[PDB]
Design an enzyme around this catalytic site. Structure first.
Site, PDB file in Angstrom:
ATOM      1  N   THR A   1      20.885  22.026 -13.585  1.00  0.00           N
ATOM      2  CA  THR A   1      22.364  22.037 -13.344  1.00  0.00           C
ATOM      3  C   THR A   1      23.038  21.492 -14.586  1.00  0.00           C
ATOM      4  O   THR A   1      22.573  20.506 -15.156  1.00  0.00           O
ATOM      5  CB  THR A   1      22.771  21.164 -12.143  1.00  0.00           C
ATOM      6  OG1 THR A   1      22.099  21.658 -11.000  1.00  0.00           O
ATOM      7  CG2 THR A   1      24.258  21.249 -11.849  1.00  0.00           C
ATOM      8  N   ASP A  32      24.045  23.411  -4.132  1.00  0.00           N
ATOM      9  CA  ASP A  32      25.415  22.981  -4.095  1.00  0.00           C
ATOM     10  C   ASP A  32      26.287  23.525  -5.228  1.00  0.00           C
ATOM     11  O   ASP A  32      27.500  23.593  -5.076  1.00  0.00           O
ATOM     12  CB  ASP A  32      25.477  21.468  -4.155  1.00  0.00           C
ATOM     13  CG  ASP A  32      24.875  20.919  -5.427  1.00  0.00           C
ATOM     14  OD1 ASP A  32      23.649  20.842  -5.510  1.00  0.00           O
ATOM     15  OD2 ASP A  32      25.614  20.559  -6.336  1.00  0.00           O
ATOM     16  N   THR A  51      25.871  16.917  -9.577  1.00  0.00           N
ATOM     17  CA  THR A  51      24.531  17.357  -9.772  1.00  0.00           C
ATOM     18  C   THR A  51      23.641  16.365  -8.992  1.00  0.00           C
ATOM     19  O   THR A  51      24.001  15.194  -8.800  1.00  0.00           O
ATOM     20  CB  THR A  51      24.183  17.386 -11.284  1.00  0.00           C
ATOM     21  OG1 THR A  51      22.757  17.356 -11.484  1.00  0.00           O
ATOM     22  CG2 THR A  51      24.797  16.140 -12.008  1.00  0.00           C
TER      23      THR A  51
END
Ligand code: NA
Ligand code: NA
Ligand code: NA
Ligand code: NA
Lengths: 131, 157, 155, 131
Positions: A1, A32, A51
């Site tokens: 991420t 997410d 993150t």
């Protein structure tokens, strides 16, 4: 991420998050990062990118939560990111970076490290992995 | 009342991170932050700055997005990204990308050109081509480091 | 204390909707509500009640989920759902489902079995088959009134 | 979009939403219903399911908002719902249904109708389309 949050000189906030997701995940699993209000959020007053453990970030709506505590608890950026990391995670491991429309930048995380860098116009500049 | 910017390359860092890699990571974060600083000094909008910085993070193979992304169990790359512009809370998101060189820019196009805020998988690959963005073979995204990492992941039991 | 339950079948109702459709929608809502009321009356957990009510809403072709789902431009169906259990904030979501009879129940299985909170498209279809849920041809979900509606959407 | 919110006798809340999505949508388009915090949210104090314009629900993280104003502003369920509806759809159109852990049930919406039903154990019971 990876991710980036910016407030420009006009006081406009934006946020952006991208990932390859979890190693050895099966197809079709979504974390997410693409989920508005979890990994990415921006509004009038701030911009956030998260993150860490998607399960924690998703159930905690973590990025929107920075905005919600500024809005409804009247906390300023640093204290709001502090509040979210400290109260909206427990046992979940995540971090986040944020900017306010007033030109502040904050980062917070509750694991061992987070690759991040921040800067403000008047010359503060930090690149950090640990605390 | 001035500009500010943060970049991240992920939480979850192992305390035994070798120095070598620590220095690479810092050098990459500096480079991406400086790109963002430079765009902000010359009055580029927030929304264009975040995209620009994240494209650079995607391109570089060091962190988990774009080329250098984590691998699925089958050894391939499936990528996702989202973007939001604060002043009117405009959103765009993409998931299940296997061919799009820069997912974040596709997320930007969802925000700007789609009546929807989130497009994924075949639909999203179809939207990429309608929008003319750069597309490549999945192998493009797969680096040797991650092939090794996934070897370990699968050993982890 | 005391139990409570709400059901909905979507916002935005056409003000032209005829009286007999109105009565049909209300008869559906009442049936679903009554299933949940008895479940609550025999003490079944909130999380099992919302699944069971939504499965009835999915099965009945009147509203836009499960059979009776809105059609894509190609005239097929793609479904999605989410579920959340408040006590520990456990979440499960699914999208891009094309053969799964009850999407909400697949969401529940994502909550309860998956290390992930969201699975979609072919991964979700393979997850359904690992979990042994009921899968059907896409045509099963497509109703004639929705075929007519789609043709109108196409201004 | 269909949905259900429940609070059980032991006080636990839960929420569920399911949809076919927008008519004539192209393949791969995803709305608010599968998005935690937007279409669906439940926590210790409440359970919420949203319906209406996906764009407005997603950008406002509306299901979570109800929980947030309960939790940070201390509004009770009915006031929470009134507030989110009247004061957090700047122009978007939506509705929602919710329950509180105290046993309340609420519905609200700003467009011209919403297919809904509600009951409480005390006896309350209501099924409606318009006002
Ligand atoms: Na990369
Ligand atoms: Na859009
Ligand atoms: Na149905
Ligand atoms: Na799960």
């Amino acid at each position: 991420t990876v991710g980036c949050v910016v407030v420009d000189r006009e006081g406009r906030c934006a946020a952006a998050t991208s990932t390859g997701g979890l190693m050895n995940k099966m197809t079709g699993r979504i974390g997410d990062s693409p989920l508005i209000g979890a990994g990415t959020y921006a509004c009038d007053v701030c911009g956030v990118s998260c993150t860490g453990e998607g399960e924690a970030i998703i159930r905690g709506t973590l990025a929107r939560e920075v905005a919600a505590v500024m809005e409804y608890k009247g906390l300023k950026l640093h204290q709001a990111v502090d509040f979210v990391i400290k109260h909206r995670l427990d046992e979940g491991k995540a971090g986040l970076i944020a900017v306010s429309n007033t030109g502040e930048v904050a980062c917070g995380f509750n694991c061992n490290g987070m690759f991040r860098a921040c800067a403000t116009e008047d010359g503060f500049m930090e690149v950090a992995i640990w605390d | 009342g001035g500009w500010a910017i943060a970049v991240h390359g992920g939480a979850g860092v192992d305390p035994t991170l070798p120095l070598e890699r620590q220095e690479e990571a810092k050098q990459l974060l500096t480079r991406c932050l400086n790109l963002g600083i430079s765009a902000l000094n010359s009055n580029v909008p927030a929304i264009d700055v975040v995209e620009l910085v994240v494209r650079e993070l995607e391109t570089d193979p060091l962190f988990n997005s774009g080329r250098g992304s984590a691998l699925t169990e089958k050894g391939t790359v499936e990528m996702e990204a989202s973007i939001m512009d604060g002043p009117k809370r405009r959103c765009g998101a993409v998931s299940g990308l296997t061919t799009v060189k820069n997912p974040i820019s596709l997320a930007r196009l969802v925000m700007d050109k789609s009546p929807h805020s989130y497009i994924a998988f075949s639909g999203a690959e179809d939207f990429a081509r309608q929008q003319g963005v750069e597309v490549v073979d999945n192998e493009y995204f797969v680096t040797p480091d991650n092939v090794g990492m996934l070897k370990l992941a699968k050993e982890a039991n």
